[PDB]
Design a binder for this molecule. Structure first.
Ligand SMILES: Cc1noc(C)c1NC(=O)NCc1cccc(-n2ncc(C(=O)Nc3ccc4nc(N)[nH]c4c3)c2O)c1
Ligand SMILES: [Ca+2]
Ligand SMILES: [Cl-]
Lengths: 57, 247
């Protein structure tokens, strides 16, 4: 699943035996209940630009 | 950087400037509060390993605005497979003496998982490259941080359109108009995917820049994720330079 469309994951994707897939998030993010989306858990998560994130807050 | 634009202050918050005796040495990329990724070749000629400084939150080198944060470089880790004065395995992992403080102007770039980087990021066409390097081949370096959007080539396509190994990739333009350049080595090639930016390349080097028929060469960071991760879990060792086995 992970090789196509990133498995639908916003960030990291792992295949498991069966038609199974688990998405994961980097440190400083948590996975939402959709099982795909990652939301920041800290003020300055990696790979986000604060002055642009605040321009859209 | 040739043919780019000024990176608006705070929009490249992972960019690092490396100094040796106050002089511009190279760029780098912040990946955590104490870890910077740069290019191995930046360190081929260092005599006094204790005068290396990393600066975060830099933008205009002509002024001090208070967002800058300077740290001593405590460790420079280079793969065993890197040969000084060459391009293959051109990567260094730098440990800072004290963490930087994350702020609006100081933010790490995400170091991706290998699978994600190989399966997904490697197919994102355009990525950003940045630095205070030369604005033209054989020209003056930039005083304000510059940034350039460059497209990535598959290596077969690089060779046809021009030794590029599996540890590198080509990106940029073959018309001499837009490129990374001397002074940019070690800086980030950052790739956006679904709202977040990731480290996919390190500015390496070549003979001159913005040369018709030649693309910029980048270290393929996906080959080093496991190597980097293991080192970031390790305790520091006495002596700044450390050569670490690769793989
Ligand atoms: C062992 C050894 N034997 O011989 C040498 C030569 C050795 N090593 C050192 O002298 N190391 C010292 C050292 C430190 C820092 C920089 C440099 N340094 N010097 C030149 C450049 C450069 O041209 N860079 C660059 C960048 C982007 C580019 N994008 C494109 N298209 N082209 C590009 C080129 C650079 O980065 C060298
Ligand atoms: Ca400044
Ligand atoms: Cl030492």
């Amino acid at each position: 699943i992970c090789v196509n469309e990133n498995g639908g994951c916003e960030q990291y994707c792992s295949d498991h035996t069966g038609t199974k897939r688990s998405c994961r998030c980097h440190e400083g993010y948590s996975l939402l209940a959709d099982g795909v989306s990652c939301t920041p858990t800290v003020e300055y998560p990696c790979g986000k630009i604060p002055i642009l994130e605040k321009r859209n807050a | 950087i040739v043919g780019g634009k000024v990176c608006p202050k705070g929009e490249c918050p992972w960019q690092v400037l490396l100094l040796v005796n106050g002089a511009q040495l190279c760029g780098g990329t912040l990946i955590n509060t104490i870890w910077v990724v740069s290019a191995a070749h930046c360190f081929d000629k260092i005599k006094n390993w204790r005068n290396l400084i990393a600066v975060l939150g830099e933008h205009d080198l002509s002024e001090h605005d208070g967002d800058e944060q300077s740290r001593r470089v405590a460790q420079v880790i280079i793969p065993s497979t890197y040969v000084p004065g060459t391009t293959n395995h051109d990567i260094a992992l730098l440990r800072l003496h004290q963490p930087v403080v994350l702020t609006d102007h100081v933010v790490p770039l995400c170091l991706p998982e290998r699978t994600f980087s190989e399966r997904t990021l490697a197919f994102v066409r355009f990525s950003l490259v940045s630095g205070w390097g030369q604005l033209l081949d054989r020209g003056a370096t930039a005083l304000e941080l510059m940034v350039l959007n460059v497209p990535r080539l598959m290596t077969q396509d690089c060779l046809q359109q021009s030794n590029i190994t599996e540890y590198m990739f080509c990106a940029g333009y073959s018309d001499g108009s837009k490129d990374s350049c001397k002074g940019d080595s070690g800086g980030p090639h950052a790739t956006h995917y679904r709202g977040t930016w990731y480290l996919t390349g390190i500015v390496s080097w070549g003979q001159g820049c913005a040369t018709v028929g030649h693309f910029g060469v980048y270290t393929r960071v996906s080959q080093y994720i496991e190597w980097l991760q293991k080192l970031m879990r390790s305790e520091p060792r006495p002596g700044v330079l450390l050569r670490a086995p690769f793989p």
